């Protein structure tokens, strides 16, 4: 089936090479921030990141084996999670700050410009602090990000073809588990430290799920208040969660 036949180090390389680039913001220091304008920047950025994500996802081993229907569902379910773990990752070296872009580095007090957004910034900054405390490695990050892609929507899939696709996904997920463990072993962690750290990293995905759900609702309310014009792509991702 390919993907399954990959070694750990092969798995790592594939994920590392598939990594999307860091994009810039259309941030214009000419004008002061407004709620509408900050929401404009952030969502414009998200939109352009999405296109790269979609293409990144296809380079995640096992993902293109799935139906178009299943690829869509997985991405629809996990897109904001995937954006957030990437953000939290590149924000690691910047305590008290979120590096949305190299030209867009925001602290929590700048998040207060948008109503109810500082709560989301606070959670994001805490996660970044958590990753920094754990000394999260790049190889570990790309494993976690692929795990989010394959797992977050797998439970929301009758039929037997639907079970064949579910099984295949879990096969690949188990492969990344093997990859993560192998990484920690190579890094010289004890056998005990291996399963302890594996647990720590995966439990963070529960908070990332939480941040996404709070983020989805916040973005949705901004939409329903006509604060920001969203791309048709974003409207469709947002729509996939119903929300209210």
């Amino acid at each position: 089936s390919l993907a399954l036949s990959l070694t750990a180090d092969q798995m790592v390389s594939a994920l590392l090479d598939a990594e999307p680039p860091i994009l810039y913001s259309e941030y214009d220091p000419t004008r002061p921030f407004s709620e509408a304008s900050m929401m404009g920047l952030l969502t414009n950025l998200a939109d352009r990141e999405l296109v790269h994500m979609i293409n990144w996802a296809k380079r995640v081993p096992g993902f293109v084996d799935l139906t178009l229907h299943d690829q869509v569902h997985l991405l629809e379910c996990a897109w904001l999670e995937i954006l957030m773990i990437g953000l939290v990752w590149r924000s690691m070296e910047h305590p008290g700050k979120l590096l949305f872009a190299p030209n867009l580095l925001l602290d929590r007090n700048q998040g207060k410009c948008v109503e109810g957004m500082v709560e989301i910034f606070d959670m994001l900054l805490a996660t970044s602090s958590r990753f920094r405390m754990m000394n999260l490695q790049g190889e570990e990050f790309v494993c976690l990000k692929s795990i989010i892609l394959l797992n977050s929507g797998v439970y929301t899939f009758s039929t037997l073809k639907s079970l064949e696709e579910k099984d295949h996904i879990h096969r690949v997920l188990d492969k990344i588990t093997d990859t993560l463990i192998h990484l920690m072993a190579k890094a010289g962690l004890t056998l005990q430290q291996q399963h302890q750290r594996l647990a720590q990293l995966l439990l963070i995905l529960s908070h990332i799920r939480h941040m996404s759900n709070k983020g989805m609702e916040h973005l949705y309310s901004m939409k329903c208040k006509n604060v920001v014009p969203l791309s048709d792509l974003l409207l469709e991702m947002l729509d996939a969660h119903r929300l209210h």
């Binding site: 296109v51 296809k58 178009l68 690829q71 869509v72 469709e236 991702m237």
Partner: peptide
């Protein structure tokens, strides 16, 4: 139809 569906082909 859906943009995401279209993008997953291009």
């Amino acid at each position: 139809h859906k943009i995401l569906h279209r993008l997953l082909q291009d």
